[PDB]
Symmetry: D2
């Protein structure tokens, strides 16, 4: 009697997006009848080899031959923890779905070989984009069955207010996104962060809050910006942005940089604009009229029940398990 | 706040496979949080037009703009009912998934005149789930223009029925009705054919007529060994290359290998998963059953029971129910 | 193979609390694997008798002997509709749970003549879920003879709305309609009353009229502090000792303490869980709000937010939906 | 955001009824959206104190303050494991429901004090019967909120055949039930066991099989016997018999010894007979006519959807969590 299990981290800061994504996916999994394998984030060097082995035995205690396990990677307990977890799993007669949230060596490059080595033990890989799959294959990943995630969902019941404020929201940490501290354009940029830092003139810093609260606020109008530093441009063209799903779930259109992964989703669903640089974005906002905006808003709100009800996640969770067996 | 609803027939004989299929899908759908729109099977001519309209209003009472509806077709209340239900649904600001269980104009040649009306209501859907890519291509030839399609691939068979060890019994199981499958009435081979049917008729010498039994009992009995035969009459060969067989799923869920004819829709599922034999004709199937050895049979059985959790947990159905709704929203 | 179904109204104004309640229960029921029987709110006089009969046939199309049905009453299609629905259900070999949301003959004195007809259809159920033990005792006085009863106790309020820190604001929240709650139009106290209503009317000097907002927004706003008032007009004092207040659940789910009148049904829930104050009259409530200190308020808020996961996860409802079905089967 | 967790053992023999009951309860819990804390049955003496501590940390890794945990006891890892698990749980700001499957010291009496000590750390206790609650209170249990289980469910889709064979079924191990090896009555007793033992004349031993298979067989008619040895009579008047639920789920009436816990369920629902001794039972079967049997069968099949759909378990799982908070 096959039971599907999914790993899920615990113990990170409430402000950790990594943990938010894993927990949200697990909430959806549980609603599909899948079972959680909880993982606490701690300092692995404090375990002896036998203590770590038995801690892992505690985590996997409920597993049986014939099950399927979805490994949400990474655990953020370091590569050693991820390798040793995958080793335990491979002791069972089960199929393993590797669900990639991040590829840390592409964000520590030297750890790529060890990472690829444990990736290859999986039966199916779910990756953010076809470009990321292709990239991993160039580094030796040879898992034959793959599934593309496409987009993060954003389950929520936040009310959507009627939507054209010529301003831009950016719910991201300025320490990770340096372009923030360099903002110089006259259109307002609202930075939602827990960071105790002062920023440029037209940047209006706002304190970190509940997601639900953010979404109501944003649904009133304007534009959502998805953007990365020059340092991270290579990774941005591979990953799925969590803030993208958040803008769309709020019910407003987005502005994303050309090259961002899965851009055809934005294009084919008319969810906003794909632009070359911030200058072109600032232009689009200053220049867009009301009827154009109304059109974009309608597209976004026609599309976003997928995000708000968790369907990107339901489909990858179902298709990956299916592929693992068939 | 989107809800997903799915239509589901009721009121047919217990032995009706059409209803078994819809009900099984609906049970899976409900486990996914989808809601049932129950439809009773009755004689539509007994309603005045306003009575039919208000009966349908009763069926769709819980629907709201912004929902998604999965219409399992046909309802078996006749094409007229199917058309009128789709009309009622299209009055709502919803997306519609058309889940094809059968296509009436293709099942029988004399009913081909219904094709235009069928295509016309089909074309009102946003997504079409069809048994096979070939069925999709054939429907497009007759004018279906729905841009989003999903291939079902195989019927599931959700169950927890125990599987007994499968012995190599040189016998063939066929839980189908002899009135629909004329080849059973002509069986002339020296391999026993076990026919499970409610039909009160005597059958050829080498056919063992077994009385209709509940699906769970059938599964348990079949799991004990032998082979499952999926086969159609000469009149039905075209549909065979198009449809998904329900008994195919049943054999596999029971844990025994199957025998099917070359050209059957979705045959690569059988090949790629090592689930049985694809044969040219009945004569070839008889030769394989007579000539298979114990090791080869153990292997087939291993492949089937390695594969069948997908069926017993309803994953062909979970994946189509999830993907079609996704595609419907875009 | 038993399925459990539950009726659920549709078609009322978004601001209709009756529909909010039924829908909220149904969402919980669906999470438990129960199936919806949708009912649309309409003008019953527009159906001929055969049309109404067949509309109902549409609503119950999916039902089978051996199911259990939970009838949330009233449908608000009038007593006549409620009686006819119960008649249709009693044609099936099923068990029926009657889930009382309101009792029309008790809400208004002039409608007391409806009591006999109401009791007569109530008596067709196998189990009755009622807001309070007092309501059960009162109904038995008017002839209800159903042997199995379940006490609801409190409305849940399933939600994930964020709770802001609750500041001690010396202000009282009342998300109710001034047309139904005349006391709001007479407010003369120096503590501000925040009234959330779609009603286009000006209100007394110390009443802050706030426009109707979606429940999630209301919850978030109320969580910021103050007190929630549950109160009825003099004409409604008898019903108060009988019913469950929906806004009571809303205040608690928002994470603020409440103020209620002595004698309100199920008042021990408030007392035993330290959720607010039970007062003699409005004057006493004003005195408490003026005189409460920060520490005492922090304590109340701690008690409320310790208790409210039961509400936000819908456990009063899960327990009545589970226990009533159990009792129905015996 | 409160999440309900439930413990569940793994690693016992497929023939272990203890594990069957825990797994069945957990399957129902999962359908209610509760989450499993898997526990593997192993030899505790092989762990050092720190290894056991971290194994337990692995088991409870997903827990958070504000959750509710249902502890199905015992784990069968020995009392030390149960005590130390309860200790871990008490480090969290959670409510604990203790769901008693067995009380091992009443089945090792000397371990009662330690057992009662860890029981008392729970917020709510679910016990098989009010008599068991009263008994535990006489040994010092002072948990204020209690819930009575009443009966084991028996979720199943086994077909029920039409039901009057004057024979008696007993799906129980003769090593535990010695009265089996002493059977001497002329009415057939069918013993379903994996035990490789030969038995008296009118005892027809049958090999252990899938439950689903057993139930179809039994639904054809006759009577189900629930009975205990003289050694176990005191415990029988406290516990919930699993085989009782099995007979009823099959769709035939039962014969139980006077004094068995929760006997009013049998009486009030007309599910069979409560008798003084085997002699009276043998009499009832020999003497019952068809119309009486038809009546009993109808009662049983009117009642058994509760068992077959898991409602005794759904109600205790829901009511205990409710009581834990209110
Ligand atoms: O005040 C805030 C600001 C941020 N966020 C959440 O944090 C996310 C952004 O985190 P991150 O930058 O790490 O996501 P990324 O787009 O890089 O994947 C947003 O989508 C929000 O959902 C929030 O809940 N409250
Ligand atoms: O004794 C029986 C015989 C048949 N069936 C059911 O009927 C199905 C076959 O029906 P049908 O021939 O109409 O299906 P098809 O394979 O043609 O799609 C089997 O798989 C069983 O599920 C059954 O339950 N009991
Ligand atoms: O702006 C508003 C005002 C009211 N309500 C809802 O209406 C309920 C109160 O309705 P009613 O007075 O009819 O309920 P009662 O307490 O009398 O049962 C509140 O709890 C809210 O759920 C709302 O959603 N938004
Ligand atoms: O061949 C068999 C015999 C036993 N059982 C199961 O084992 C249970 C009896 O186990 P046990 O005696 O330990 O239960 P108890 O009544 O003592 O609680 C029965 O109810 C059956 O469900 C089974 O599945 N197959
Ligand atoms: Cl992190
Ligand atoms: Cl044991």
């Amino acid at each position: 009697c096959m039971r599907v299990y999914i790993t899920n981290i615990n113990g990170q800061s409430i402000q950790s997006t990594a943990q938010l994504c894993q927990n949200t996916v697990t909430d959806v999994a549980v609603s599909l009848g899948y079972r959680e394998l909880g993982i606490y984030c701690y300092q692995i060097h404090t375990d002896s080899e036998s203590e770590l082995s038995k801690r892992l035995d505690g985590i996997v205690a409920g597993l049986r031959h014939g099950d399927v396990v979805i490994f949400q990677t990474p655990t953020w307990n370091t590569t050693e923890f991820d390798e040793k977890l995958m080793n335990k799993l491979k002791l069972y007669d089960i199929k393993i779905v590797l669900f990639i949230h991040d590829v840390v060596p592409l964000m520590n490059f030297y750890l790529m070989d060890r990472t690829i080595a444990y990736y290859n033990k999986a039966d199916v890989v779910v990756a953010p984009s076809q470009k990321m799959i292709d990239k991993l294959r160039d580094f030796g990943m040879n898992v034959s069955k793959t599934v593309v995630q496409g987009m993060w969902d954003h389950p929520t019941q936040a009310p959507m207010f009627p939507a054209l404020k010529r301003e831009i929201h950016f719910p991201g940490n300025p320490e990770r996104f340096s372009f923030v501290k360099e903002w110089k354009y006259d259109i307002p940029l609202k930075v939602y962060t827990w960071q105790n830092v002062e920023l440029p003139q037209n940047v209006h810093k706002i304190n970190y809050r509940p997601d639900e609260q953010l979404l109501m606020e944003m649904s009133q109008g304007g534009f959502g910006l998805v953007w990365m530093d020059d340092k991270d441009k290579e990774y941005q063209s591979l990953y799925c942005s969590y803030k993208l799903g958040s803008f769309l779930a709020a019910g407003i259109p987005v502005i994303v940089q050309e090259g961002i992964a899965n851009q055809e989703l934005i294009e084919n669903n008319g969810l906003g604009w794909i632009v070359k640089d911030v200058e072109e974005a600032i232009m689009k906002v200053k220049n867009v009229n009301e009827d154009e905006y109304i059109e974009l808003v309608k597209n976004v709100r026609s599309f976003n029940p997928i995000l708000r009800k968790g369907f990107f996640t339901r489909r990858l969770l179902t298709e990956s398990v299916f592929q693992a067996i068939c």
